[PDB]
Amino acid sequence: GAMAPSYRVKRMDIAKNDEECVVNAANPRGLPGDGVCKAVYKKWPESFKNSATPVGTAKTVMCGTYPVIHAVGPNFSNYTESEGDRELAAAYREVAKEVTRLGVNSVAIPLLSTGVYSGGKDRLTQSLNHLFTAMDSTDADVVIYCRDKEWEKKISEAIQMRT
């Protein structure tokens, strides 16, 4: 574990992380996709060998020795708010099991079920609270990667609020 487990947020490309493993905002089919998924595909394409996995699950594939944890958040265009919420919580619980299993001291993570999976809605608070619920019991340093200047501020405030 980390000596004093922490949360941090950075506004930059998760493909340039300084952590021991990465969480991909994957699709269920292991396709290159767009946004974070496409950035992960460009940096670690070997990790998309048999990466397909259902909604609400996480599947780890090694790129060399570097673990990519493919986490599949629901697409809120297809799910009810109720069922979407349940699957988004579940995907994060599966990320926490994999981070633990791998024995890493740090993990880079994006906010799942945002952007194209958001169903046209700001889900910063919903996605961040499910991330905390899952990762609070892990001792890895968690570095959250974001792509909105306002989101960086709000995520940073939510981390400080709890400390």
**Binding-site residues for ADP-D-ribose:** 13, 27, 35, 115-117
Which residues, other chains included, contact 79 with Cβ-Cβ below 8 Å and sequence gap of 6+? 87, 119
* Exposed/middle/buried for residue 8 (C-beta within 10 Å: 0-12, 13-18, 19+): middle
In the bound complex, what is the minimum distance in angstroms from residue 70's beta carbon to Cl ion? 21
120 makes contact, choosing from ligand ONQ, Cl ion, none, with CB < 5 to 8 Å by partner type, with ligand ONQ
In the bound complex, what is the minimum distance in angstroms from residue 78's beta carbon to ligand ONQ? 15
83 binds ligand ONQ (CB under 6 A): no
Q: How many residues bind Cl ion (CB under 5 A)?
A: 2
Distance between CA atoms of residues 27 and 72, nearest Å: 6
Query: Which C-beta is closer to Cl ion: that of 135 or that of 144?
Result: 144
Q: Which of 122, 136, 139, 157 binds ligand ONQ (CB under 6 A)?
A: 122
Q: Which of 8, 11, 97, 154 binds ligand ONQ (CB under 6 A)?
A: 11
Query: Which C-beta is closer to ligand ONQ: that of 2 or that of 12?
Result: 12
Touching ligand ONQ, residues 135-154 (CB under 6 A)? 147-149, 151
Mark the segment that binds Cl ion (CB under 5 A) among 5-13, 61-69, 72-80, 103-111. 5-13
Which residues, other chains included, contact 32 with Cβ-Cβ below 8 Å and sequence gap of 6+? 38, 41, 48
